[PDB]
Design a protein around this ligand. Structure first.
Ligand SMILES: [Cu+2]
Ligand SMILES: [Cu+2]
Ligand SMILES: [Zn+2]
Length: 259
């Protein structure tokens, strides 16, 4: 299923016609009301183990750009916190705005950040990603907010390759990239059960959203905004505002790892 996007004629308000789960019981993103989130002393320490991460390639897929990892072994994994067992990193990507005052998917007391990073992991008990996305605990996505201020040195290698993947369907080698350079100092987080935030909107995700944003420079985010939704030789449509707004919380509680 093709043709969904972020424009007025195929954006988030239309997705439910082809993806009825868009109106489901555990859709993402959500607004994080920080005063209603409750500290959960049962949460375990989160473990982000990216030392042996093996990046492979960066791809413009027409919706965002994905940095892809070799997930054929436990090389980069997420464990602990709300999670049972081991989740393997498969890709990361971002969502961002046309302006610094919008771009994130999750919001914090209705505050929109300039962008949001998603590090996507699948539960190794299900053998591969495709089977993991048929399970209610198949995926874990680590979300990190971006605000505009000082430059993030560990983002710059990503920014510098974007020129080579301007249009949909372009890819480039992207080996030897260390995703640890994209994390904030603190691993304090909020967690809740949700979904993919793009079609097919599957309800498989344990969301882990870090409280501390990373700072990126205006120049870094401006380069995200030079990408294109369209393919080569087609009319240019800047890749901006590729975020889904907050969805109803319904019968969910957001838990905090910190007091
Ligand atoms: Cu289709
Ligand atoms: Cu697509
Ligand atoms: Zn995402």
């Amino acid at each position: 299923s093709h043709h969904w996007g972020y424009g007025k004629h195929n954006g988030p308000e239309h997705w439910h016609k082809d993806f009825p789960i868009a109106k489901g019981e555990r859709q993402s993103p959500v607004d994080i009301d920080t005063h209603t989130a409750k500290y959960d002393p049962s949460l375990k320490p989160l473990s982000v183990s990216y030392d042996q991460a093996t990046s492979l390639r960066i791809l413009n897929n027409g919706h965002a750009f994905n940095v892809e990892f070799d997930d054929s072994q436990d090389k980069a994994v997420l464990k602990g916190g709300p999670l049972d067992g081991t989740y393997r990193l498969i890709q990361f990507h971002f969502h961002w705005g046309s302006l610094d005052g919008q771009g994130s998917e999750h919001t914090v007391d209705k505050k929109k950040y300039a962008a949001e990073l998603h590090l996507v992991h699948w539960n190794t008990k299900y053998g591969d990603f495709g089977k993991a996305v048929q399970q209610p605990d198949g995926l874990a996505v680590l979300g990190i907010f971006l605000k505009v201020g000082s430059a993030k040195p560990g983002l710059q290698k990503v920014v510098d390759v974007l020129d080579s993947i301007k249009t949909k369907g372009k890819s480039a080698d992207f080996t030897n990239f260390d995703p640890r350079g994209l994390l904030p100092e603190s691993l304090d987080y909020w967690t809740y059960p949700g979904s993919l935030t793009t079609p097919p909107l599957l309800e498989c995700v344990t969301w882990i959203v870090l409280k501390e944003p990373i700072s990126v420079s205006s120049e870094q985010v401006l380069k995200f905004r030079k990408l294109n939704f369209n393919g080569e030789g087609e009319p240019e449509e800047l890749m901006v505002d590729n975020w889904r707004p907050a969805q109803p919380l319904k019968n969910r509680q957001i838990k905090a790892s910190f007091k």
